[PDB]
Paper text:
Overproduced, affinity-tagged TraT was solubilised using the detergent dodecylmaltoside (DDM) and purified. Cryo-electron microscopy (cryo-EM) of the TraT preparation revealed homogeneous ~100 Å wide particles from which we were able to solve a 2 Å resolution structure of the TraT complex. The overall structure resembles a chef’s hat in shape but with an internal cavity extending along the entire long axis. The bottom of the ‘hat’ inserts into the OM bilayer as judged from the position of the detergent micelle and from the local surface hydrophobicity. The TraT monomer comprises three distinct elements: a globular core domain, two transmembrane α-helices (TMHs), and a long β-hairpin. The globular core domain is composed of two α-helices packed against a predominantly antiparallel five-stranded β-sheet from which the TMHs and the β-hairpin extend. The membrane-spanning portion of each TraT subunit extends from the core domain and consists of two TMHs connected by a short, periplasmic loop of four amino acids (S136-A139). Notably, the TMHs from neighboring TraT subunits do not pack tightly against each other, rendering them relatively mobile and poorly resolved. The hairpin structures of adjacent TraT protomers associate into a continuous β-sheet that forms a ring around the interior face of the open end of the TraT cavity. In the native cellular environment, the transmembrane end of the TraT cavity is almost certainly sealed by a lipid plug and so does not form an open channel across the OM. However, the structural data show that TraT is actually an integral OM protein in which a large globular domain associates with the membrane bilayer through a pair of TMHs in each subunit.
In incompatibility group F (IncF) plasmids surface exclusion is mediated by the outer membrane protein TraT. TraT is an outer membrane (OM) lipoprotein that is exposed at the cell surface. TraS blocks DNA transfer following mating pair formation (“entry exclusion”) whilst TraT acts at an earlier stage to inhibit mating pair formation (“surface exclusion”). TraT is a hollow homodecamer shaped like a chef’s hat.
Numbering used by the authors:
A (entry chain H), B (entry chain I), C (entry chain G), D (entry chain F), E (entry chain E), F (entry chain D), ...: 22 to 247
Amino acid sequence: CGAMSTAIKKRNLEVKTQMSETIWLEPASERTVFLQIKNTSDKDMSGLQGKIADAVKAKGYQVVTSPDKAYYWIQANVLKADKMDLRESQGWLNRGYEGAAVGAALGAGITGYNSNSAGATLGVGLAAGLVGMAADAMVEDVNYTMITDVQIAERTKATVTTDNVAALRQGTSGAKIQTSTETGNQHKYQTRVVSNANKVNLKFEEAKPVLEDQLAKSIANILMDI
Amino acid sequence: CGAMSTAIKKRNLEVKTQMSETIWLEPASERTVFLQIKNTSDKDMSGLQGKIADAVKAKGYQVVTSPDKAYYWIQANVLKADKMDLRESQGWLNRGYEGAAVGAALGAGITGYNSNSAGATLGVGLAAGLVGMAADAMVEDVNYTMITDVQIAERTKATVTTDNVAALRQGTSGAKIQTSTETGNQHKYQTRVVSNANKVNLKFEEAKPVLEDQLAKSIANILMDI
Amino acid sequence: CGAMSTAIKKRNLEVKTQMSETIWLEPASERTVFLQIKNTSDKDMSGLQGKIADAVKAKGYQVVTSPDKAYYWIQANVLKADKMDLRESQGWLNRGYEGAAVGAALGAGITGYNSNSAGATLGVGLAAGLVGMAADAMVEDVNYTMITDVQIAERTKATVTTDNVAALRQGTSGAKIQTSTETGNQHKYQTRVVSNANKVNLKFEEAKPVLEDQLAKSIANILMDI
Amino acid sequence: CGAMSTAIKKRNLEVKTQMSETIWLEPASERTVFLQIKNTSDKDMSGLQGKIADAVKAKGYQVVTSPDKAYYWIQANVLKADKMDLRESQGWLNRGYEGAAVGAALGAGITGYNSNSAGATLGVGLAAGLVGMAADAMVEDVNYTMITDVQIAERTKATVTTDNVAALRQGTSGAKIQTSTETGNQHKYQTRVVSNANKVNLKFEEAKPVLEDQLAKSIANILMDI
Amino acid sequence: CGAMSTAIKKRNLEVKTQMSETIWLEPASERTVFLQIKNTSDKDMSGLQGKIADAVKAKGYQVVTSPDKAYYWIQANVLKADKMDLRESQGWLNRGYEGAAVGAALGAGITGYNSNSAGATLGVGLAAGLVGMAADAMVEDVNYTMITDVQIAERTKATVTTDNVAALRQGTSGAKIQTSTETGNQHKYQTRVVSNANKVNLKFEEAKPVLEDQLAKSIANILMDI
Amino acid sequence: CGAMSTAIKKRNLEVKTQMSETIWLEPASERTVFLQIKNTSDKDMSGLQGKIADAVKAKGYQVVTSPDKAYYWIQANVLKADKMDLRESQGWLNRGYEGAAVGAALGAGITGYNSNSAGATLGVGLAAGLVGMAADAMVEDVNYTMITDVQIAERTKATVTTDNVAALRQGTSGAKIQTSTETGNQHKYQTRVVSNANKVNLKFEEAKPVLEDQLAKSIANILMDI
Amino acid sequence: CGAMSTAIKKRNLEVKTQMSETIWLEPASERTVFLQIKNTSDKDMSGLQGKIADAVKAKGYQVVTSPDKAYYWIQANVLKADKMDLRESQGWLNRGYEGAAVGAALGAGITGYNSNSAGATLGVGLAAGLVGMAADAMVEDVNYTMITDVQIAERTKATVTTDNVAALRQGTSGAKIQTSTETGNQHKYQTRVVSNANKVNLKFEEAKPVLEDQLAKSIANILMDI
Amino acid sequence: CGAMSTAIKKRNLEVKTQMSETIWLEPASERTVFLQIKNTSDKDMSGLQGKIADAVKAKGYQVVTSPDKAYYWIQANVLKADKMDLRESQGWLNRGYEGAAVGAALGAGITGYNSNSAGATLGVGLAAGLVGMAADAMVEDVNYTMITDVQIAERTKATVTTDNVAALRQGTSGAKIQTSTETGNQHKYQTRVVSNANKVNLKFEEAKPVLEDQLAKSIANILMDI
Amino acid sequence: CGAMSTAIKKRNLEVKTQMSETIWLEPASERTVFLQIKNTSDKDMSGLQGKIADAVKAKGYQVVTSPDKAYYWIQANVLKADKMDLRESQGWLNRGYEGAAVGAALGAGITGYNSNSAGATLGVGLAAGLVGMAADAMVEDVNYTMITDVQIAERTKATVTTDNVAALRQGTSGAKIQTSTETGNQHKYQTRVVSNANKVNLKFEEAKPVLEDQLAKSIANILMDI
């Protein structure tokens, strides 16, 4: 019952995109944005940069190819992606014991009353039980989790001091501490977006365009309209 | 029994809006408000800005389109939205085992006494049990959770110093610390509003106007009347 | 049932590569990269350096053999690799008791009704039960976990101070603390990549080319295109 | 069933070598290495030093017998070694109760139907049960764990200050704190390697050459090729 | 079954010696060692000092009787020794209930079918059950644990400052703090060695020579060869 | 069964003496020791001082009666002693229920078949059960725990500053803090010795000479021979 | 069975006296002691002061009635005393249910076979069960716990500064902090003695002389002989 | 059985008085005491002040009515008093279910064999069961707990500084901190006394004189005799 | 049984008043008190101020209406009051299941033997069971908890500094810190009184006069008599 229940509940693709924290931007009249999209995950998001540019341009901004003449920077990295089956947390039922029991009972029942003979009701029941167990194992609640790191840069008139601190671990004994200081006129803020795609026997190709569309809109909505 | 019990209990739309903390504002005679509404969530709240303006104007304030000549700022961001089924926390009953048992017993019972024959009471019972299990899976206690970040700005005669501190994580080794200082005559306060919409098989389109109305009134009620 | 369920679920090779943290790099026009790939693990990844160079060159960079004339350094070390069987966490079922019970019942059942005689149904059942238990033990959900440490170096105009701190443990009594200070014009950042390969009775030779391909792309994608 | 299941699963020698942490070394053109290998454990690793020298020489380095004219030092100590039986964590089954039950049932069964007589089926069953329990106790999942401490020294142009701090515990009352300071031109880093050897009824002599080979390669791979 | 299972598993003497931490010594050309071995435990280790001297001399060092002309000091104290029975952690089975049940069943069984009479099968069964319970109690998994504190002294050219801090507890109210400072040219490091000897009904006299041999080699192996 | 099992296992006196921590003493040519032995416990250890003097003199030292002309001080206090029954941690079995059940069954069994009559088998069984319960209560695993505080003083050339800090609790409100400072040429170190004596129905008089002998040797072994 | 088991085990008075911590006193030739014994507990210890004086005088000291000409002070306070029944921690068995069951069964059994009649076996059984329950309630494992605070004063040549700190709690709002400083030539140390007296149905009058004798010896043994 | 067991065990009044901490007073020749006794509890302790004066005068002190000419102050406050039933922690048995079961069985048993008729055995049993349940509820293990705060003042020659610190909580926002400093020649110490009175169906009037007597003696015993 | 057991146990009104902490007041000859009683709770305590004045006047003090000429201030606020049913913590028994079972059994029993007929014993039993369940629900162990904050002010000659610190929370972002300093000659102390009133089906009107009387006496008893 668990296999078909999962199939009915998760019959439709469900995509959820959740931004971790709110980045507040001062009102301004500038409309130049520079984009820098990376993907260090093992899954394809090649269409993300184009969709972000379209969403940003639809809000009244102009996308420039050189970062020096851009008032805003949108830096995004699709950091990691994970795949898991939600049925695996239900216990031993996900293994296929329930599917085997239903198949075995159906095979013996359909043979025990119709042409019972002797031994035939065991061979058919075993074959049906094996098929039932196999069919249970082929149904999984596939869930795709994606993590995207977003960095937004805004130009400012105030002097901004950037202190780079890095504790480069060297072994089990210690680390190499690197320090430097630079000044500029740019404020940088970071935020994280978590994406989820869920469907029965979901293939990432089907969920890829929807994940890109929702992720692009969420990142582009940090900027104010016009 | 769980499916119909959920349907009866959650037959009506229930919307709850809860502000996290109270923002205290000094009494004043100014009535100029600037609005800035964002939506980084994956759900539509396009009518929120208009409803906030109507609620603010109904309290005696004047909405201005330029932030420089506004005594008050209302900055709101619909940060994230989540959907979950409350029946999923009830255990294995939500899977559909209870629905299958009721359907199987009804199918066998209606056939065991009326035209029992042989084998017929099993085929009808299995079909009825499958339908009963399927009907249980199609009933869910849909709950929508929404998080909205609110920032309120108030002009003041005192000098306000803003120190921007950002620890931009760079990897597993360290971070880039950004610091800057600016002065102004504006006080900013933050608060959070949590919204909930609950109904059986709820679609967000039905709950969207109610969520917007309650959220707009809650945010606009931070300001005093007149 | 657990043995064949594992075989069906894990019938295909699944490789997952996940970068731990995002390294942000400033936009630049330099395209010289120096590579330094190490492997202190007990498994072969000899093709990793060549695949990283191909992926880096495909993005518009030029690989140089001398570190002094390289704007970027990519230092990677395949630190450790582990092998485990996921079925071992299922309990006593992984031992082979379930396989023995199925084999014993099948052996006695196929003999109890056909040529029952006396004592024969026990010898066949014991032999079939032993074979069933043996076949269960030969099926394992092999999972390979690999840890890779990545260090990225970027040239900068700012003066960078490196303080080496090492607490070399000397016994149970204390340690020898080593300190030194050097200056340079290079920023170094660290990150970690976790790789997983899963299949039934998986041999590392089959998963080696896929692990190298995914790891090379993930590391090379830290750099921006062109 | 546990005894033969362990024998089948652990029928082949499995050796795992895992370095705890990554030691990063700056690129250089020096190729002189000094070796210093110790063994304070109770197990023989006499061939480790020779295998490290061969692996180091195969990577293009020259091994020198005097530490003063060596750019690199490789100091390794096989600190401790432990032996344990993995079956001991399975519970009372490892004691031999399961083996006794199988032997007792087989002895009584083979006698209860063939020449039952009286009392004979108890003497044979008891003898077979004792043999079955004894055979279970002679099968163990032997696992050898080895800990190796590694210290790597690299010459540098920077001045290195070494502060020796030792809190020599004197009783339950206090300690004798020893402090000293020396300067030099050598950086030292520490790391740890954990080795595991697993097989049914494993003897350390069989696993000794494999442990030495994997440990030597792991330590020598800290150095870059050529 | 537990008694004979323990006898078979622990039929051979097993001695394990594990050094807690690694003491690193700089390479040097000195070969003078001074020994100072103490034993505050309740067990005899009179042969430890002689075996340490033999192991040290076999590595190329010269043992001197006066500490002032020794480059190295080896100070060892056999601090404490403990004896425990590993069967005591198995529960009530170690008491002898299992042995009584086997003896009682054997006594009644051997009499119930052969010369049953009346009352005789109870007297023999009770006597056999008592003997079986007694034999179970005489079998124990004897484990000897030994703790040895090791202090190694090395001459150095640097000035070494020793600060003696002792918080001598005086009652429940406070303590007497003693402080002093001395200077010297000797570095001292501490480490701990844990020894284990396990056998069925083990007597410490049998395990004494093996414990001394392994402990002496472990301590002497802190020094480099030649 | 628990009563006789305890009697067999603990039939012999077992004395364990364990020093808590190691006190390290510098090599020296002095051989004058002053003894000061106290006993604040409730048990007799009158022979401890004489045995310590004999053990110290057997190692080449000379015992002096005046502390001013002694290079070493040995101050020991037998602080506390405790007595407990190890069978009390076994549960309700130590109460005597098991002994009553065995006695009641034996009384009824020996009467139920031989001269059964009526009512006689109950009076004899009750009397035998009461005796069996009483005999169980008279068997206890007596364990004696003793704590001894040891303070060792050594003359030194360095100036030793003793700061006496005492927080004399005055009530629930506060305390009276006492502070003083003195200088001297004597180092004091503290350690603790834990003694255990275990036997069935053990009387402290039997274990007293063995406890004194082991305690005296352990304390005297802090000093080096000759 | 619990009632008589407790009576047999605790048939003899057992008194345990345990000093919490060791007070170390420097060797000296003075023999003047001043005593000050208090008793704030609810139990009589009137003979404690006399027994302490006798024990102190037996060790060679002279007791003086004026504190100004005494080198040593012994200040003791019997702080508190508690009484508890150890059977109360055994559960519901201590209530008397076990005693009622034994009495009820004995009453019905002695009447069911001898002059059974009708109804008589219930009246006798109820009366015997009530008596059995009552007798169980009259047996208790009485344990007396006593806490004694000890303060020892020793004259010294060093200047001793006493800082009195008292945080006198004034309500739920705060406290009144009292501070003062005095100088003197006397060192004070504190320790605690815990006394236990255990017997079945123990009356404190029987345990009073033994508690006084053990407490007096323990306190007087802080001083060295002669 | 629980009701009568409680009645037998707690048939006599038991009063326990325990002082929390020891207040140490320097020996002196002054004998003037000023008393100040308060009672903020809800129970009557009107006789406490008179009994303290009698106990103090019996020890050789003189009670004065004006605090300025008193060397000692005894300030006591009976802070709070609580009443609880110890049977309430036994579970549902204290409710009266056990009493109802005994009464119901007795009523049915006395009627089932004597004049059974029909229905009569139910009416009598119900009435007897109700009476039995009612009688169980009227028996309670009444325990009275009393807390007394004691403050003792002693004149001194040293200057005493009293710093009054009070954090008067003002709301959920903050507090009003009050600070002041005064000097005097009086030391104040605080301690707490806990009193317990236990009996079946105890009325506080019966326990009042005993509580006063024990409390008065405990407080007066802080002072030394004469 | 739970309903009537609660009715019998709680048949009488029980009022408990407990002061949290003791406020110590210096002896003085002043007798002017100013009262200020507030009640922010939802329950009526209108008679509290009059009863406090009567209790204060009965102790020899004079109540003044102007705070400036009062040596003592008594400020009290009845902060909050809560009502709860103690039967609600007993579990499902408080719901009324036990009452329904008793009523159903009584209804069926009184009809099953007298005029059994058919179906009549079910209608009467259901009606009686419903009445029994209803009667159980109408019985509750009503407990009223009241919290009273007390502030006592005392005039003093010392200068008292009051620092007002208030952290007025402004939102989720921060707070507004208010600070001020004033000087005066008045000490203020705070304490808390907890009041409890318990009875079956208790109405607050019945417990109001008793709560006022006990609360007034407790607060007035902080002051010394005369």
